[PDB]
Ligand binder design. Sequence first.
Ligand SMILES: NC(=O)c1ccc[n+]([C@@H]2O[C@H](COP(=O)([O-])OP(=O)(O)OC[C@H]3O[C@@H](n4cnc5c(N)ncnc54)[C@H](OP(=O)(O)O)[C@@H]3O)[C@@H](O)[C@H]2O)c1
Ligand SMILES: CCc1nc(N)nc(N)c1OCCCOc1cccc(C[C@@H](C(=O)O)C(F)F)c1
Ligand SMILES: [Br-]
Ligand SMILES: [Br-]
Length: 158
Amino acid sequence: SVGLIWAQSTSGVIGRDGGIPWRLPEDLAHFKRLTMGHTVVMGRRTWDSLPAAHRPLPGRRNVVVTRQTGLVAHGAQVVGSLEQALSAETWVIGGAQIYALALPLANRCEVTEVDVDLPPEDEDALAPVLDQTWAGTSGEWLVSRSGLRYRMHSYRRL
Ligand SMILES: NC(=O)c1ccc[n+]([C@@H]2O[C@H](COP(=O)([O-])OP(=O)(O)OC[C@H]3O[C@@H](n4cnc5c(N)ncnc54)[C@H](OP(=O)(O)O)[C@@H]3O)[C@@H](O)[C@H]2O)c1
Ligand SMILES: CCc1nc(N)nc(N)c1OCCCOc1cccc(C[C@@H](C(=O)O)C(F)F)c1
Ligand SMILES: [Br-]
Ligand SMILES: [Br-]
């Protein structure tokens, strides 16, 4: 059982300049709560993007997907394909390249939509596009303690 989890702007941006272009504490809490105790699978660029005090992600088996040989990723397992990463509950935590690999294998997507305007730029990482084979249920728009508006969506494959 494979799930994808990501946070996107309304425009579909998930990443810019090797990072995430907003801060939303409620999303980090949501991400930690859903992934804790489970394997998390990430692309090598997303491993690099984790703040050092949170890398590897504590309380979870971290798996890093790379085409490199002998990659040093302390505290993580390093695999050469998504299939190697997947051999109870496994969460694919990004980025865009690894989402694209994982989406055909997933039965579940947990999406945070963040109501910031961020027109997609050339090298932005973008969220996967979900068609009508996915059934979504959405929370209401919520206002964070910091004033940002956001909404949680849960998708299951029909
Ligand atoms: N908002 C969110 O929810 C969210 C979540 C995660 C990440 N992000 C953001 O997204 C960005 C990173 O995403 P990204 O798409 O640039 O990178 P990414 O998917 O995290 O990682 C790309 C790397 O994965 C490896 N890879 C890709 N395809 C592979 C394959 N078929 N077999 C083996 N290895 C493969 C390669 O590693 P090597 O180059 O080492 O060979 C490649 O450079 C950052 O800005 C990050 O902050 C946002
Ligand atoms: C957290 C942003 C996010 N959001 C959803 N919804 N999906 C995702 N794929 C995702 O990206 C996962 C890759 C980036 O991850 C982190 C970035 C900064 C800090 C942490 C540590 C975090 C934890 O310990 O989990 C703690 F702050 F709670 C993780
Ligand atoms: Br962040
Ligand atoms: Br934060």
